[PDB]
């Protein structure tokens, strides 16, 4: 009855069949008409190649449904046929939905390893998979980046496709996403996940310190606390990174740097020093360094 014409068309879908599957609609098939495991026409296009069968069904109908947790979006994404991804922002453009709100969609699929590395993620957006999947998708980070999909869309663990880039430390794959984003103001760097952590906060843990300088010139906050009150400077301090150092001085906020706890109101104490793990627990210039620059912008600051 219903469920012999729901038959009908997602086999059509299956096979790339847009007469036939227009047909259908045409004569009051609803679009969106899903199986027991909540499959419809567009996911299966989506999986199956099906440009032009996507792309008509795109226009006619919101998918509101999950098949193995996913959306058409995601399963066109993993694909990795780019032509396809097009077909269905612009049959979605016709229809009056923008791509960002398309794009940016969250899936809800538990999981425990990406690609090759070892995650537990509850639900991602397409965007963060891609950044997980090696370099056979580095073609597709650029496409989604160039259609509005955002480096800085939220999992449900509130994490940036940019943050993952960093935790899994794969660097084409977030120059890419900087170089190849329209807007460079597109981009949401107050966003922090679940620890108060920035993406300025990460970089430094990660040593990655030309990358936080990129952060710096798009004029991210420096004065972003995390959960246990620490600022960027207090870990550029640690994380030694002299550069970036007189560049956070600089730009901090000076009710911070009084409310440093590496002094003493006064003097800078070395050993109240936490330093990172990737610096060197011997003696360093750099160890040096930022400790009398600290003390010179404290002397500065102490005057006033």
Not at 168 to 195: C, G, H, I, W
Not at 243 to 249: N, W
Request: glycine content about 6%; charged content about 25%.
């Amino acid at each position: 009855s219903d469920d012999e014409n729901m038959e009908k068309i997602h086999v059509a879908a299956r096979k790339g069949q847009t007469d036939e599957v227009r047909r259908l609609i045409e004569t009051g098939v609803s679009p969106t008409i899903q199986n027991r495991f909540g499959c419809t026409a567009l996911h299966l296009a989506c999986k199956f190649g099906c440009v032009d069968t996507a792309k008509y069904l795109a226009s006619v109908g919101e998918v509101h449904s999950l098949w193995h947790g996913q959306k058409p979006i995601h399963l066109a994404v993993m694909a990795n046929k780019t032509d396809l991804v097009v077909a269905l922002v612009e049959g979605a453009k016709e229809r009056g939905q923008m791509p960002e709100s398309l794009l940016n969609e969250c899936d809800e699929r538990e999981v425990n390893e990406i690609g090759s590395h070892v995650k537990h993620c509850k639900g991602q957006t397409a965007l963060h998979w891609c950044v997980g999947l090696g370099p056979e998708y580095l073609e597709m980070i650029k496409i989604l980046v160039q259609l509005g999909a955002s480096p800085t869309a939220k999992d449900k663990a509130d994490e940036t496709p940019l943050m993952r880039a960093m935790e899994f430390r794969n660097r084409e794959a977030l120059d890419l996403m900087m170089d190849t984003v329209p807007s460079k103001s597109s981009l949401r760097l107050d966003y922090a996940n679940k620890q108060g952590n920035s993406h300025l906060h990460w970089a430094i843990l990660i040593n990655w310190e030309d990358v936080a300088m990129r952060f710096v010139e798009m004029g991210i906050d420096v004065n972003m606390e995390d959960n246990e009150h620490t600022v960027p400077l207090y870990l550029s301090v640690r994380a030694a990174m002299v550069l970036l150092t007189k560049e956070l001085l600089q730009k901090t906020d000076v009710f911070l740097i009084q409310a440093c706890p590496y002094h003493n109101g006064t003097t800078v104490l070395p050993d109240r020093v936490v330093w990172l793990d990737f610096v060197p627990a011997a003696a360093d210039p750099s160890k040096q360094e930022v400790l009398q620059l600290l003390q010179e912008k404290l002397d500065e600051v102490v005057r006033s």
